[PDB]
Amino acid sequence: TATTLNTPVVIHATQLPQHVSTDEVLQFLESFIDEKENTNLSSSISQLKRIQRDFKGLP
């Protein structure tokens, strides 16, 4: 697999890493699922369901 139907031709990264504030780490995981179902799966994904609560609370 992994043809042009599913992968970009070039993945050049512009500007630079621009998040070293260490304080604005929120607002993405609480909003990514908002723009997702309101269904990406290849065969099985489970780390997305246990990667958000680490910064906030406990598993």
Partner 1 sequence: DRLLNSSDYTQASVCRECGSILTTQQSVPRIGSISTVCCRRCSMRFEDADSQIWEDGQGNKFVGGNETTTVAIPFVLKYLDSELSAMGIRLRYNVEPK
Partner 2 sequence: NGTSNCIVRVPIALYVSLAPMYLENPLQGVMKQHLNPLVMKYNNKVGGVVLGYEGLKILDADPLSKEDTSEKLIKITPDTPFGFTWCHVNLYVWQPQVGDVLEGYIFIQSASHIGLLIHDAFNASGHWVDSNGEPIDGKLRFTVRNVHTTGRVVSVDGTLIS
Partner 3 sequence: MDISKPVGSEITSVDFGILTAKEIRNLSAKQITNPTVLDNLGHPVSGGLYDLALGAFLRNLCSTCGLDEKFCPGHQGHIELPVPCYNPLFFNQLYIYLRASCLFCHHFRLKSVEVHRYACKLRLLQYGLIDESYKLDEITLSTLLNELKSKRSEYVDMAIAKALSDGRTTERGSFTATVNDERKKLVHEFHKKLLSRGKCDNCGMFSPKFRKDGFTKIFETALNEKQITNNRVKGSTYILSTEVKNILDTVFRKEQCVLQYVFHSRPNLSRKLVKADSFFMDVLVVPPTRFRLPSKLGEEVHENSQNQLLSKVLTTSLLIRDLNDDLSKLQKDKVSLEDRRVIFSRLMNAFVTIQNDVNAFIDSTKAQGRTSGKVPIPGVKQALEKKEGLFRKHMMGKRVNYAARSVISPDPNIETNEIGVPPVFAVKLTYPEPVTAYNIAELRQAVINGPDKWPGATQIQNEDGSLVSLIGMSVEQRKALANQLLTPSSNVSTHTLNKKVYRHIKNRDVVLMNRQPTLHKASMMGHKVRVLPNEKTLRLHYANTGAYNADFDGDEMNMHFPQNENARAEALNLANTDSQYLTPTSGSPVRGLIQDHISAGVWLTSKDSF
**Minimal distance, residue 45 CB to partner 2, in Å:** 5
Yes or no: say if 59 and 53 are a contact pair by the CB < 8 Å rule: yes
Binder of partner 1 out of 5, 6, 10, 21 (CB under 8 A): 10
- In sequence order, which residues have a C-beta less than 8 Å from that of residue 19 and are 6 or more positions away? 25
Interaction of residue 9 with partner 1, rule CB under 8 A: yes
Smallest CA-to-CA distance from 40 within 3, 6, 8 is with 6
Residues that bind partner 2 (CB under 8 A): 4-20, 22, 25, 28-29, 31-32, 35, 40, 42, 45, 47-48, 50-51, 54, 59
